[PDB]
Structures are given as C-alpha cells and as structure tokens.
A paper describes a structure:
Myosin heads consist of a motor domain (MD), which has the catalytic and actin binding functions, and a lever arm that amplifies small structural changes within the MD to produce filament sliding. The lever arm consists of a small folded domain, dubbed the converter, a long α-helical peptide that binds the two light chains, an essential light chain, ELC, and a regulatory light chain, RLC. Insect flight muscle (IFM) possesses a highly ordered paracrystalline arrangement of myosin and actin filaments that provides detailed X-ray diffraction patterns and electron micrographs. Here we report on further investigations into the HST state of IFM using a 2 ms duration stretch (str-HST) or release (rls-HST) and their effect on both the structure and distribution of cross-bridges as they adjust to the mechanical perturbation.
Residue numbers in the entry:
A (entry chain B), C (entry chain A): 112 to 167
B (entry chain K), D (entry chain M), E (entry chain L): 1 to 372
The structure:
C-alpha cells in the first residue's frame, strides 16, 4: 500500500509543478497585457481630449 | 434626499482642494490651496478693493500678492487662512449655503487630536453646518477600491504616507510619512531640465514645467538599463511645445524625475524610498496580517499617477518580501481622486447616517464628541 | 512511512487542484484583458488619425 | 431514534472542544476553548457590537480581544465563560436546540465532586436538556479501545494523566497527573527553533510553530544515538515552507521536543516523566491487577500522537517492569478523539439508556443524583 | 601585578562598549558600538583613505558612511564587524597590546553556546590574549551589588532581561527577555515631542532628543494622577535650551516616555511590561527561592536610571506579590556600569585566577574549554 501511494504522490507532485509553472507564466504575461491595455487606454483620453479641444 | 443630495465632501490638501456633492463620481471643485494677500493698494478695473484672494484668483494674480499655503504637509498650519479656503469652497465654488448641508471632511494620517477638535469647532461654530464627520484620507482611498484591509501608499503634493488599515482601523504605530511629493518633484525636474541646457525664466516658463512632469513623465521599471537605453538613443525622446513655438525636448529626464521617489538621494534626501517604506510599514505590523497587506497595496494620490509606477512597485516589493507571499499593487485610474470618491460613496451610503456628528451631539458634548 | 506519504500526497493533490483552478481563472481573465487591449488599440489609431487630419 | 439520533457528546478540553452526535465516528465540531472579550469599542463591517467571541472567531480576532481559557488543566475554572462555550457548541456549532437532546459530557480524572454537581446544575437548569451524564475521560478512551481494564496515559493540551481502570472503575488512589502537555511542548519547540537561529516574530510566525510540532515532530527510540546520528548529518533534516517562501529547516530539534515528555528536565521541570509515571501508577495498584494494567497501556490524547511514542514507551516500561511480565502499549490511530469516540459508542448503546440522569431524577434528587 | 594590573574588562553592548582595567572603579572607555563604512571615495584633510570607522568617529562622520550595529539585542550578529570593535578597543581606546593582558568579556543571558565558543576562538586565535573569561551580564551586575542570589532587571540600549540568579547560577528557564529598551524609548519621545508641535529636522536636532530623555525624563509613581496633575498645570513643566537658543518646553511627556516601560501598549507592543515580567520570572522559579528573589531585585542598565523607577517598581510588585512577602528593589547610583564594575571586582579578585581560561587550556581542549 505504501509503494503505490508513494508512486501516485510523485506523479501528482510532478503534475502540480508543471501546472504551477504555467500559471506563473500566464499571471506574468497578464500583468504585461493589462498594463499595456492601461498605457494604451490613457494615451487615447489624452489624444481624444486633444482631438475635442483642437476640433473646438 | 434631505441630505442624500445634500452631503458635501471636502478633501483638503497641501496643493489642491477637491470638493463636491456626495453622490457625484468626481469632485465638482478642484483648485489651489492658497490665500493671497495683496502686496500693494489698488484695484482691478470694475472691482473693489479686495483684502484677500483664494485658489485660482490667487494663483493668477500672484505677482501682486503674498501667497500662503494653509496646509503644510497635510496638517492645517494656519487656521485664519483655512477658514478662508473653506468659505471660498462653500460660497463661491459650490455656491451652497453650508447651514443646511452635512459636510464630510478629511484629515491626515496622524492628525493631532486637537486639530480634529478645532476644525469641528470651526465647522459647527462659524459655518453652522447641520452635521459633519472627519474621515482619514488613506482610509477613504482604500474603501473606494472596495476593500477594508490593505496598506495605502498615499502621495500628493506636500506628503507621502503608508497607512496600513485592518478592517477599517488605520494602524497608528505602522504609518510612515515621507515629506517628498509632487511639489518636490516638479522642482527637481526643473533643475534637470535647466541642466539639460534650458531656461525657465518668466513665470509662464516656471508653471509649465509642472505640466511637463504630469504629461511626459514616466516611472520606468529597470531604471538601470533605461539610462543605458537613453545613451544608444532610441526614439525614447519627447519634445513638448511651450506657450509659444519654443519646442523643448526631454528625452531621458522624463524618468529621472520619478526615479526620485525610489532614490531620495537624487535630491539630497537621506530618508528611505517609497518601496522600502511600504515594506517597513509592513514588517512593523502584526505577523498574521502581513499576507493581507501584501496582496493589497492600494495606491492613491496625484504623484502616484506616473505610468509604470505600479510595475516598478510590484517588482520592488516582490524582491523584498518572503517568496511564500503574494504581492498585489492596486493602482486605479481615478486615483488622483480616490480619497474624495471614497468619501462620496461613504457619505451617500445608507448606513452612514448614524455616524454623522450633529449639532445636537456637539452643543451637548463639546468638540470631544467627533474627536472619537 | 506510509501514513506520512499518504498525508503528503493528499496535501500536494489538494494544492495541485487549488493552483489548477487559479490558472484557469487567470487564463480566462486574459483572453478578456488581451481582447479589450486590442479593441482599445484600434479606435485612437482611428481617433489619432482623425486628430492629425483636423490639426492639419 | 427519539434519542438514538438525539444524544450529544461533548468533550471539554483545555485546548479544544470535541462535539457531535452519538452515533458518528468522529466529532462534528472541534474548536478552541477560548472566550474573547474585546479590548475596545467598535464593530466589524456589517455586524453589530459583540460582547464576546468564542472558539475560532476569538482566535482569529485575537489582536482586539482579551482571550481567556475556562478550563485550566482539565478542570473548569470559570463557569461564566464555560456556559459561554457550551452555548456556542449547541447553538452555533451543532445548531441544535439543547432542550430536546440528551447530552453526554466528560470530566477529568479527580474532578471535584462539586464541579460535577455544578455542570449538572447548569446543564439542567440553564440549558434545560432532557437528560445528561458525565463520563470520566480516561474511562471513555479505554472503552473505545474495546476493553475495561487497562491503564490510560492521557495527554492533551494542558494535562497528562495516568488512570488505572479495573472493570470500569477508575482507581482514585493510583491516578497521576503531570501538568506538562502539548501547550508546554509547542513553547519549548519555539525556543529550540529560535535557538536554531530563527525568529517567530509576527503572529503568523507564532501559530505555525505548533503546525511544525504536529507535522514534523518525532519520538525517537534511542534518543541517545539519535543526537549522535544528527551530528554525522544524515538526511534526517526536514525543511518546512512558511506562510510565504521562507523555508525553515528543522533537522534535529524535531525529536528534542517530544524527548521533553520523558525528560521534564529539558524544561526546568523536576517531576518524573511519562514512562516512570506509567510505572509508578502501576506499583501503587493492587498486586494481582498489575499483570492486567501492564498488558493494557492504552494511549489517548493529541500529544500522544508523535510517531514512535509507543515504541519508546514499550521499551521504556519493559525495562522497568519485572521480566516475568507482558508489556503492551496500545496506541490507536484515531487517538486524538478516543475519549469522544468512547462517548459516542457508549451513549448510542442499547444498555446506556438506564444510566441517563433525567430531569425527573434531578428535579426530585438535587445535583447529588448524577454526582454518584 | 603581572596580571593584577593587567586584566582587561570589556562589556559589549548593543549601544555602548564599556572597557578599562580590572581594578578601576569605572570604565576607562565608553563609546558607540558602530562600524561605519564610507559610502564614497575620498579623504579628510591630512589623513589617508580609511576603509572603516568605529565608535565616535563613525558617529561624527555618519553622513558619508553606512553605519552598522554588530550586536543586535545583546547577541553578536556580525563577527567581522565585532572583531573591528574589539581591535579598536584594545589598540586605540585602551592603547594596550592584547597579547600580554588577560581579558574578561561579557555575554548576554541565553547567549548561544556556539557564540561563546566563537568569541573565544577570536580572542585566542586572532588577538592572542594570554587568558580570557566570559561572564554573564546580569550575574556581574548582581555581584557588584555584593550579593549572590537575587533577580536582576537588566535594561540597556537594545534589550531588557530578568535573570534570576541563585548562589551564582543564573536560572535558564526563568530568564525573560523583552526587546524594548532605551533606543526604542528615545524614538518614542521623539514622536511625543514632535507631536507636542515640534521639529527635529537636522541631525543636530535628532541626537539631542536622546539628551533630553536622559536629563529631563522621569518615572512617576502614580502615573495616573500625574497626567491629571499635568492638566491643572503646575510648575511641573521643563524647558531645555537646544544647540542654539531655541528653548524647547517639555512638561508632561517627560514621564510619558518611561511609562512606556510599564505599558508597552504606548508603542504598539503587545508584550507584558517590566514589573509583570519581574514577577512572572519569579513565579517560574522554585517556590522556596521566591522569598529571596523578592527581597533582591537588583537593577542595572542605562535605561533603569530614569528617577523614580525604583519606587514605581517597588509598588508595582508589592501589589502583585503575596502580602506575606518582603519586596526590595535595589537600584545603585553607578547602575549604568554595574555589569562592568562587577567584572572589575571579580577579575581583580584574589580567587579568580584559577578560573581564567589560558592558551594552555585552549590549545589543548578546543573552544569547548571555556564554553563550560
């Protein structure tokens, strides 16, 4: 019973590492994607306000 | 409606006042926190002799007046001149009569007990407001971001603060104050820009260095290999056109200015910087609450608006915090008004009615009543 | 040795589930964040082109 | 079913309450035996003013409350605060109304006559339970291991005991109490771990030393040449990852902590240790019953769960007992709930119905009735 | 004379080193326990490039160096920087060559075995002293007050301790350490004095708050009706003249600072205070020795010098101790050097010669020899 439970432990610990790495790479790609979404959505409100003032 | 419409929210700052009605999404009134006193006798065409000037008329006419700032580093230092800014806010800016409006005011982090009692004395006894309430600024900022536990890095015009808050109670012994903010930051840009070979000679040159700081300044992550980048000279440069043609270029200094917030040494300050201070606040708090504070670094204040401030802070504290920890730097877009918006929400709220200090409480308990 | 390895197995399997859920919630939040970043990056390339023509 | 379903079993401890329904295999409710009283006036968001807190809400909110333990060393010391823990158990934890449930309670080994009468007074007169019964703890532990004669080494959070039982009657004059248990043991680990060059500084560092003790601590047999082993430095070491990354390593101290149970001298205790005390209990009993007690050393309690406790005890008393004797140390896996399980069995039993003290017995005989 | 003259006594502290010759009445050398490392390359006029600075030259030149404290809370934390402070002590401060002087050193209460062996390794192997000896600090303080059994409340710059000693042997399991001392106390005064409406802005303002604490601070007995007294405003106030004219007044806060030692809650500390801790040490000791400890509360350390500390402690423990007991709080005048003086006495003593660890003992037994 012990040897079968050690083997299963090893396999689920390896899957847990393999997925924990995937989360961290997405979680980081996203602080990036959200930050470029926000740097983009500021530049505009300055350019669109700049548009409405130079149209006025 | 009696007071649903009727609650006022006045956030008193070192540089700006933000004011308006609880309910609104943003301040109806924003203006400098100055009180100008004319250096000479005379008049403007069509007006009478004016003893005093406040806000923008004091800024615009600054050449003939002696300008004074009532709030030094977030604390009210001159009460004669503050009652003047309040008067202006109610009567001219919001054009309301104060004696029928409940007023939510804000104070600073370790605001002396005696001050909270004094502005209550002036609110009730010289403005005769029905009821009032003083909220702590970081606490309204947090709450406006939905939560109740977190640590706010709050940074405006004269002060920076770190106020760790747990289930609403700001933690007195863990609060840190760093007297370097947006005011200090405009004057440093000034020098690195004259030092770029320029001259902000007339007052129309002075004022706009501040509009350069706001529009073009950045907080780079890896400020190290950003200077290095500056040198290879990429299309990192940025030219601004002055009141006239005089196109001034700012490439590099653009980020050397907010690197002052992480390195106070850029300005002859020996104090620690924003990120270390976030952290030190945190290793001054209870142990069990430190995972909470780390996942809830809420930013508020005009000077925390520099793009990429959050990414630099993100990486600044990850790399100081134990790896078992989750770091999370919340920086909302409306952050230059977080404080105010948190007050608008709270004061328009359904449950806040029972915390308003009324003239009944006051006339019966003395200023002590609201002081808590 | 068997009871300690069963307990560790149980705890790492529980962590593996708990993190696999976190990845899926981030991975989805991101198709959203990237898509709003792109719906944003088209309309201010349009509004800034509209700006440069009404400035000219 | 009337009461087959309906019998409650509440085991009151120095650290934990274990509670649930007679019939179940394990306690439905397990929680700290604390009652917190708020040090300041104020509220949590959305709740009202609370006068008191019990169990985990008292632990979680410990920074604003004064925590108090009603049971000192297994004996109820504060009856106002105990009625509070019972109230919480019935109404919030098990969510039952007590006035229709028979309640089996437990008491400690030489529990003063007057207490057994007082908790009966409170069970019947303030909770109005239909019927109740007080079992002695070691006696339920034994019985849950099937037998009726044996000696229980019982060890939990504030007390250790040896209760020799013969055909069900616990032997008053042979019972030994040693006031060093799991609570004492977590605080000693604490020091040998700070002494390993560490800091359990915030409250999130304090609490988890106890989770280190539970998960990684061992009772080595031949604790002598285990220290010797430590030195050659084998892969005996064991690193635990804290709330954050901060991987702490514990090699050796891992077993220096339960060696405290055999050597009280590790903690400035001059009393004898667990194994000697097992033995002394035994040479205080009748002669003819000593072979029985020796082949039936039943262990129960959270602190007897340290792996290899049984092997060390096995060899500890073989080598003190006359060689003509059979030693036998029974340590079941569910032992942190033996006491409770013994109560669940007994109270769900077919023959126990005729020992329940009913309100009829009480209203007619006074607290004396159940006291026996 | 060989060594009658020749024995050195070095007491290593968290804030100060006290040093001199066994025989003298007071330390020949007292100086900060810092090691400064220059932040920039350059020189003072007439000197060469200096890699390092120690004691007062590190304090005086602090603006261009990174200051570091080798002893954190009484324990040596950096051995590179400690060997630097020792070097400075022998060669510059006492101007002796160490290789012909026996050296009595002191260590802290539960100083890790390994440290006592390490400073022995450095004393004998890098300084080549003839012989040395490490005394425990509370133990030298007691002995300098004539006696051998008592309990010392020892409080300096980074730690407070209670060390119950019986016929010379400090009692390991009854010792209590409270990490709040004179350093913590100067920083709290700082805030209650800026909070009185002040500014300790330049470094010449910072340093002198500590000289205010030493000269004007008090420990009032009945700290209750001393605040009450403050309010009626008696001639309790006290103005100090700064480096310049700037006469600062301190009335009240004067005693609010040492009330921190009885109430750690003044500074966000949840630990118990000095008097309770004296007591708890005492109800952790053997029963038969508790009358002795109570009549012999010896005080030592810079922070126990606040006038009226003894009267407050006198009444603090009388009212916690059983009335059958005799309380007696000994606080001598030289107490900021008790530790040192106890070493001077002991090491100049006629009978101590046979406990000196000699290089013969060391070269033959390893660091283990002195470790005891």
């Amino acid at each position: 019973a012990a040897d079968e439970s050690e083997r299963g432990m090893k396999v689920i610990e390896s899957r847990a590492q393999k997925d924990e790495e995937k989360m961290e790479i997405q979680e980081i790609q996203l602080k990036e994607a959200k930050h470029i979404a926000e740097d983009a959505d500021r530049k505009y409100e300055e350019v669109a306000r700049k548009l409405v003032i130079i149209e006025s | 409606d009696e007071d649903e419409t009727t609650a006022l929210v006045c956030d008193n700052g070192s540089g700006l006042v933000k004011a308006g009605f609880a309910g609104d999404d943003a301040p109806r009134a924003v203006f400098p926190s100055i009180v100008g006193r004319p250096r000479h006798q005379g008049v403007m065409v069509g007006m009478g002799q004016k003893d005093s000037y406040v806000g923008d008329e004091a800024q615009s006419k600054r050449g003939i007046l002696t300008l004074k700032y009532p709030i030094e580093h977030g604390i009210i230092t001159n009460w004669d001149d503050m009652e003047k800014i309040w008067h202006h806010t109610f009567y001219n800016e919001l054009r309301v009569a104060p004696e029928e409006h409940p007023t939510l005011l804000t104070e600073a982090p370790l605001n002396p007990k005696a001050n909270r009692e004094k502005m209550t004395q002036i609110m009730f006894e010289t403005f005769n407001v029905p009821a009032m309430y003083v909220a702590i600024q970081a606490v309204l900022s947090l709450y406006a971001s939905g939560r109740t536990t977190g640590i706010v890095l709050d940074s405006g015009d004269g002060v920076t603060h770190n106020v760790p808050i747990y289930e609403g109670y700001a933690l007195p012994h863990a609060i840190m104050r760093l007297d370097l903010a947006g005011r200090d930051l405009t004057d440093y840009l000034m020098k690195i820009l004259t030092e770029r070979g320029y001259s902000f000679v007339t007052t129309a040159e002075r004022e706009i260095v501040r509009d350069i700081k706001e529009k073009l300044c950045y907080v780079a992550l890896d400020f190290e290999n950003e200077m290095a980048t500056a040198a290879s000279s990429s299309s990192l440069e940025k030219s601004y056109e002055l009141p006239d043609g005089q196109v001034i270029t700012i490439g590099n200094e653009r980020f050397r200015c907010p690197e002052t917030l992480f390195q106070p040494s850029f300005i002859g300050m020996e104090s620690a910087g924003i990120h270390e201070t976030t952290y030190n606040s945190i290793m001054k708090c209870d142990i069990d609450i430190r995972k909470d504070l780390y996942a809830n670094n809420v930013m508020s204040g005009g000077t925390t608006m520099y793009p990429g401030i959050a990414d630099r802070m993100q990486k600044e504290i990850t790399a100081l915090a134990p790896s078992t920890m989750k770091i999370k730097i919340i920086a909302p877009p409306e952050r230059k008004y977080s404080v105010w918006i948190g007050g608008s929400i709270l004061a328009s709220l359904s449950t806040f009615q029972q915390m308003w200090i009324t003239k009944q409480e006051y006339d019966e308990a003395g200023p002590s009543i609201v002081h808590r």
